[PDB]
Write a protein that binds this ligand. Structure first.
Ligand SMILES: *C(=O)[C@@H]([C@@H]1N=C(C(=O)O)[C@H](S[C@@H]2CN[C@H](C(=O)N(C)C)C2)[C@@H]1C)[C@@H](C)O
Length: 267
């Protein structure tokens, strides 16, 4: 980290808030860390871990992913771009999971959170893989309040990265479910201006974004596969002191670039 600690501080000072980064080179175990153990709001980024928890359950329930789910108009909350198109038909659990990951579909996320036993059930899943930091406490959209100092609905960049590595590259999911989780992340549509903007076009990447809409709070986490070397797992989270401070995608991309530079990944 010492290779880039000064550029990280300058970046967050220009941003006018706080930036949290953890990045892990899964080959050597080398890391880059900046505010890595501070809590930041998850915002919509909890939905990636939600889809992983669904996949974990599907290991014990072979009919889960194909199960149709029907929902009423009152389930459709703002930014439900996929589930609004299937209001009159329903969608399967797998389809809802893909929509939650790849479009950050809010109705889909709420339906899946219900299936898993709510915020505590997702928290329990994260505990089961060894993440003692993650906490989900509320539902979409109350969980995005991003109040300064409020630990509800937060994690740290380090724990996000550690859990993402276990789920995408480690043994937390069985191999078929692991590849499905990776495929959903690779198909994300909402992150082109964040970690992906720091990653060369010939490298594979999967990610999940979050944007709370207040307190300069937004984030992205990703697995990146540079060619010819082991994958990199990283998390970039931001917040800022004032409710109407705006988030910045460019700052997230810039922080990801610094993380890769610190790890010595030529990009
Ligand atoms: C999650 O953080 C919110 C929902 N998830 C996303 C996403 O792409 O991760 C969008 S936030 C994205 C950033 N700029 C736009 C915005 O903030 N809007 C539309 C208000 C779109 C979506 C809102 C969740 C809190 O709803």
């Amino acid at each position: 980290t010492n290779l880039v600690a000064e550029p990280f501080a300058k970046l967050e000072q220009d941003f006018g808030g706080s930036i949290g980064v953890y990045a892990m080179d899964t080959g050597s175990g080398a890391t880059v860390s900046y505010r890595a153990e501070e809590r930041f709001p998850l915002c919509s980024s909890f939905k990636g871990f939600l889809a992983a928890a669904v996949l974990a359950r599907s290991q014990q329930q072979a009919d889960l992913l194909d199960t149709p789910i029907r929902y009423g108009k009152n389930a459709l909350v703002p930014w439900s771009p996929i589930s609004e198109k299937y209001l009159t038909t329903g969608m399967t659990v797998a389809e809802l999971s893909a929509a939650a990951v790849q479009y950050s579909d809010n109705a889909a996320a709420n339906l899946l959170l219900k299936e898993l036993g709510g915020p505590a059930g997702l928290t329990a899943f994260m505990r089961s893989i060894g993440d003692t930091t993650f906490r989900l406490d509320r539902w979409q959209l109350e969980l995005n309040s991003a109040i300064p100092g409020d630990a509800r609905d937060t994690s740290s960049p380090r724990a996000v990265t550690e859990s993402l590595q276990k789920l995408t590259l480690g043994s937390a999911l069985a191999a078929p479910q692991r590849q499905q989780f990776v495929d959903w992340l690779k198909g994300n549509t909402t992150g082109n201006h964040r970690i992906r903007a720091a990653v060369p076009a010939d490298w594979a990447v999967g990610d999940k974004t979050g944007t709370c809409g207040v307190y300069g709070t937004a984030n992205d986490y990703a697995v990146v596969w540079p060619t010819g070397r082991a994958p990199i797992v990283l998390a970039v989270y931001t917040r800022a002191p004032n409710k109407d401070d705006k988030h910045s995608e460019a700052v997230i991309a810039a922080a990801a670039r610094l993380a890769l530079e610190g790890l010595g990944v030529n990009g």
